Paper text:
Here, we report a cryogenic electron microscopy (cryo-EM) structure of the full-length human HECT [name], along with solution-based conformational analyses by small-angle X-ray scattering and hydrogen–deuterium exchange mass spectrometry. Structure-based functional analyses in vitro and in cells reveal that the activity of [name] is stringently regulated by dimerization-induced autoinhibition. By contrast, HECTs form a thioester-linked intermediate with Ub before transferring it to a substrate. A RHO-family GTPase, [name] cycles between inactive, GDP-bound and active, GTP-bound forms, allowing for spatiotemporal regulation of its interactions and functions.
We thus used a mechanism-based crosslinking strategy based on the short (1.5 Å) amino and sulfhydryl-reactive succinimidyl iodoacetate (SIA)65 to trap the crucial state in which a lysine ubiquitination site of [name] is juxtaposed to the catalytic Cys876 of [name]. Our cryo-EM structure of the [name] ∆N–[name] [name] complex has a resolution of 4.2 Å, with the map being best defined for the ANKs, the MID and the large wing of the HECT N-lobe of [name] as well as the GTPase core of [name]. However, the HECT domain is drastically rearranged relative to the ANKs, with changes also affecting the interjacent MID. The crosslinked HECT domain now adopts an L-conformation, in which the active site is juxtaposed to Lys147 of [name]. The structure shows [name] cradled by the concave face of the ligase platform, contacting the majority of the ANKs. Intriguingly, the [name] binding site of [name] comprises the critical switch-I and switch-II regions and the interjacent β2-strand that are known to undergo nucleotide-dependent rearrangements. [name] recognizes the switch regions in an ordered conformation, as imposed by the binding of GTP. The ligase thus conformationally discriminates between the nucleotide-loading states of [name] and selects the GTP-bound form as a substrate. Zone I involves ANK 5 of [name], with Gln173 and Asn174 forming polar interactions with Asn26 and Thr24 of [name]. Disrupting contacts in zone III (Arg107 and Asn108 in ANK 3 of [name] and Asp38 at the base of the β2-strand of [name]) generally interferes with [name] ubiquitination.
Numbering used by the authors:
A (entry chain B): 22 to 338, 349 to 395, 437 to 903
B (entry chain C): 1 to 178
Write the structure that this text describes.
Amino acid sequence: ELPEDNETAVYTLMPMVMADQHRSVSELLSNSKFDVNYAFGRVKRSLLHIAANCGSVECLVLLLKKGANPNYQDISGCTPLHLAARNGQKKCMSKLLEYSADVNICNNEGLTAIHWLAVNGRTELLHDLVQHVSDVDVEDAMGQTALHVACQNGHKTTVQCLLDSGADINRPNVSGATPLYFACSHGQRDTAQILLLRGAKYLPDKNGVTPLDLCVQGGYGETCEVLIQYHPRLFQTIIQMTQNEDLRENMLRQVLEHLSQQSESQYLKILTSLAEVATTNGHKLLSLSSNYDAQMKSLLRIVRMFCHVFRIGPSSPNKTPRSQVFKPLELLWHSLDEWLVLIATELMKNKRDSTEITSILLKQASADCQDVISMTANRLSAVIQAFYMCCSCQMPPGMTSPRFIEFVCKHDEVLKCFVNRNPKIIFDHFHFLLECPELMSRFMHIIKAQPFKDRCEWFYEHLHSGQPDSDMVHRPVNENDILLVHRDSIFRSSCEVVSKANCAKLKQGIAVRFHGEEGMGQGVVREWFDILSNEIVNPDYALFTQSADGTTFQPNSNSYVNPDHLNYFRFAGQILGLALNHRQLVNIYFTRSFYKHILGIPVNYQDVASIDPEYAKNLQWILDNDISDLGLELTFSVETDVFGAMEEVPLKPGGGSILVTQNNKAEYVQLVTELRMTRAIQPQINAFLQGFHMFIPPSLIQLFDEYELELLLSGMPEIDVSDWIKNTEYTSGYEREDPVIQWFWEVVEDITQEERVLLLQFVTGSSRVPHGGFANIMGGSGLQNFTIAAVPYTPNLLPTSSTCINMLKLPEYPSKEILKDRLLVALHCGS
Amino acid sequence: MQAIKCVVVGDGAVGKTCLLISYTTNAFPGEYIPTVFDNYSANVMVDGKPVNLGLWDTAGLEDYDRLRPLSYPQTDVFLICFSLVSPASFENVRAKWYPEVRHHCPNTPIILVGTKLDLRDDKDTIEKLKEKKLTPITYPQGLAMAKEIGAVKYLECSALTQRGLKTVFDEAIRAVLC
Ligand SMILES: Nc1nc2c(ncn2[C@@H]2O[C@H](COP(=O)(O)OP(=O)(O)OP(=O)(O)O)[C@@H](O)[C@H]2O)c(=O)[nH]1
């Protein structure tokens, strides 16, 4: 039986009430003196609350007959009505009402039975409850009625019952919220549509936030079309909201897309409105007085939606009207052309001013005015950028509008003048050069003159735009696309699936999973590059031959033995370019000649020494001295490898009859270069370039020279831990095991540089280190600063690291000797 | 019409009760009340046909450590939850929840969600934690925890200020559908 102590009694009663032993509790209740109303615990919840919450109907009637109060409220103010109401136990409701349970009681926040019942939307219970409830429009502390939450959760049947009962349809909240306002907040369709039928009023909140403010922010296109159905006037308000910078661009695209597929008429309306507002902003943008940042951002913002929405075609559920909307834009283009003429007249003024400057030079306030024009040029640079995007979407991709090409060349001096005045203009607005190779040639020399740093980031943003990124999404790719091969024979296994599997599927994925294993980690995949890379330069495959210096690799002249070397070299190009696409490093050091082949830059005389230093010394000497009087008797014919046979072949058609002299010695050395290093392995290079350019377009990579490409492609050659800590000599580090940190600093400097790299190799998975030092460490989720986590020390414990995350688990070694011994042992085993 | 079952599992005093009451009523309780059982509902749309969302919650007591499994049957999604300001609960995921949920229902997708983001943003909270020599849980390793426990996605949300609350259920419904 229950003890005399209530605390033990409830602990005994509490487990049975769930089991619903109707008989068992009866004897204990009858033959014990414990008070049912007693509150237990800090929450002070009565036993009736627990019984009411669960479905044990029997215990309720026994407890109530014993004197349990159904009206009792705990500290939270919730009564047995609320707990039973949430679970919708109709039996509990009937018995509660039978024994004098009143439904009008409210909690501390004002929530009552109707509110909890409304949230769950049990309309059957609502039918009977409303007949008993005194008032159905009871407001909470924040002044919100029952219908407010019911509409928010989108219970179509709940609202119908409440309206039939006379529930208020236009009750404003404390802030002024309308039940339509809350319905649009969570993007409910049925409830919103029902409210319009009854004639719900449209009013803004007291705070000044209109209902459409959240709808556009929420991006629920379903609610927009119903709203616009009865209020076409608000359609224009959507266009006006584009000007405000507080709204996210991504949301506005999706909502505008959904409206587009509805009918072509609205599709035209969206385009026309965007062009009209764009025209107004453009004229405002040109004005010097108007805010410069806000206007260009607004114009670029609007243009982006117009460009994207234009590319989205309609559906049945391609004629002039797509060009008519450009007529409002041709007004903008016409002004741009006139401005391009006006600046051309400005060049005449500048040229006229140049006459005064040049005249003074020959015989040997304006700064502010030039700055304003330069600022105007910056604003002019935004509109021309918009014009390019409109032209780009004017037809399928990969083609530049012939109209675009003709006038841009017609104003070549204008563009070249602006870049000189403001080199940042290429790195601020004038970005579209990378698409058209013809326009690249005009500005490539200008761009290359700019600092390399400004060139690096501009390259990154363009290339990464087309990435099949999944890092932040971290959604696994379809297994059909993910390769599943055994690591054994990495070179053979990787190529087999790539060639056999569909090309489209492979290029759409990034995951690298081994057959029969679930392993997936950036460090593990980064290690996969290392093993694969080493096999490529492995002399056994004979694909690449060690350089004379012994620090670089280039394709072997004997690689032609393998019948499928074209295909395998093509596969290698794909893998190497894939690493560059996502920016992981490849440990291979290629020769200077090889990197030039990637960019297509012709080799020079110095590259000859890569194979035969003695022959190069002859080619540099011949150029450095006149040979007309030396009687060399050497024509344009040199021995070269032809399909493995040493034969005498002219360097050019009829070269054997052309004597080499001072006039034509410069090219003679040049021709000899490709004779040795390029033609010999030209078939191999052709396949390799084919694979590499699949992911890295030649124009984009051409921007950088051979040296810059290797630094990006292979990484920083020189490293030092001082960069990570940005200091040289402190008495303490992060205030974490500082004496151990000092020993950690003492050991790293003592150990040679080469073995410190291996320590980074284990944690990172790549022998090389990214450019920029420790400030640009790529971990599992891309940019991730290197960190070390302390661990309790145990005897013979070696450090460990989860390679996907570039972090280290360093035990709290009590002495430096243990610290250095343990990491040395890890190096031996970790090799 | 179709219906799905979703469950919230996590340590006590984490914010599971606040997450569902705040989402469904915009009201934040002022007092501290553990629970024994709860239920909620919502709606979504699929191909023009409404789809109902059913949400269940569970407590943390030893007796309910066995009844909580009894509420799993025919569950279609799980939302493992932990307190972003309490490292012990986060550590308990490996010790208790990840083995426990997988032992009973390993097949169904798992979503990791962090609550108490409001206390995570409050400056006074870190001050008292600093005096106690404690640091809040962070994002990048939390995603690693999600991978370690096999959770499909990791999210962070608030219940008082509702920062990122709505995304929690959007990813849950999106993840289960696809
Ligand atoms: N300010 C703030 N407080 C929170 C937040 N989440 C939880 N809390 C507080 O933490 C307390 C404990 O959470 P509960 O509301 O009891 O929910 P629970 O921890 O899941 O408890 P059970 O549902 O019974 O398991 C609550 O009373 C809240 O006051 C939050 O996101 N912001």
